[PDB]
């Protein structure tokens, strides 16, 4: 571990600076180092971890799609395939890294709903990103489904329907259904039920909580508009 000699608190501080500098590869390396100190992560620290790797993998996904589109046109020299493979392998490495942190040992030490659902959602997300490039394709999809389903089950028992973690989980699981599992009707049903049950719970919330919940509800609506 490159970060083994740096203090946990210093790693977190530098993750926050890296975010301000839009240096997301650094941010992710700092948060990986923080995780590897072996202590549980706070709410803020979990979100630093997620934001860092989301930005890293996002650049890789966007690049992979550009290259895959070029490759597909060229099949209507080996360089396009070779370089698409290069980016794909780097993407799979980042996903494997995140899954490794969740398995060693973030999930097994997460007992509170807000932490356990957060990590299981991430596990579904990074299996989903592996699924987007897979051509074990079925087992990867079922690993995503399993993680999302366990997170859903916990969130329905332990969190109110406006909880932003629960809402973001349902959003992402809906997209999994639509795009990965080829289950558009399941995706639409989940998005609609999630939106309506949050709507009916907004009356319980403060102004600040209302803003957090309605932000994600709008993403559910955006998708439903394209899907129906």
């Amino acid at each position: 571990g490159a970060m083994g000699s740096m203090e946990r608190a210093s790693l977190i501080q530098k993750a926050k600076l890296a975010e301000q500098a839009e240096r997301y590869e650094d941010m992710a390396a700092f948060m990986k180092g923080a995780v590897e100190k072996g202590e549980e992560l706070s709410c803020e620290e979990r979100n630093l971890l997620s934001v860092a790797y989301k930005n890293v993998v996002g650049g890789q996904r966007a690049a992979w799609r550009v290259l895959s589109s070029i490759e597909q046109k060229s099949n209507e020299g080996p360089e396009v395939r070779e370089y698409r493979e290069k980016v794909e392998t780097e993407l799979q490495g980042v996903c494997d890294t995140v899954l490794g942190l969740l398995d060693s040992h973030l999930i097994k030490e997460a007992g509170d709903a807000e932490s356990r659902v957060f990590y299981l959602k991430m596990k579904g997300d990074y299996y989903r990103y592996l699924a987007e490039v897979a051509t074990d394709k079925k087992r990867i999809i079922d690993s995503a489904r399993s993680a999302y389903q366990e997170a859903m089950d916990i969130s329905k028992k332990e969190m109110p329907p406006t909880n932003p973690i629960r809402l973001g989980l349902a959003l992402n699981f809906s997209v999994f259904h639509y795009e990965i599992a080829n289950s558009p009707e399941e995706a639409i049903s989940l998005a609609k039920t999630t939106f309506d049950e949050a709507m009916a719970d907004l009356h319980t919330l403060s102004e600040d909580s209302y803003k957090d919940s309605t932000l994600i509800m709008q993403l559910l609506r955006d998708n439903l508009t394209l899907w129906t």
């Binding site: 930005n55 996002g58 959602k121 959003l171």
Partner: peptide, 12 residues
């Protein structure tokens, strides 16, 4: 590809 909305930074 048309990318649907998912949670968090739309970094792709």
């Amino acid at each position: 590809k048309l990318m649907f909305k998912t949670e968090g930074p739309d970094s792709d």
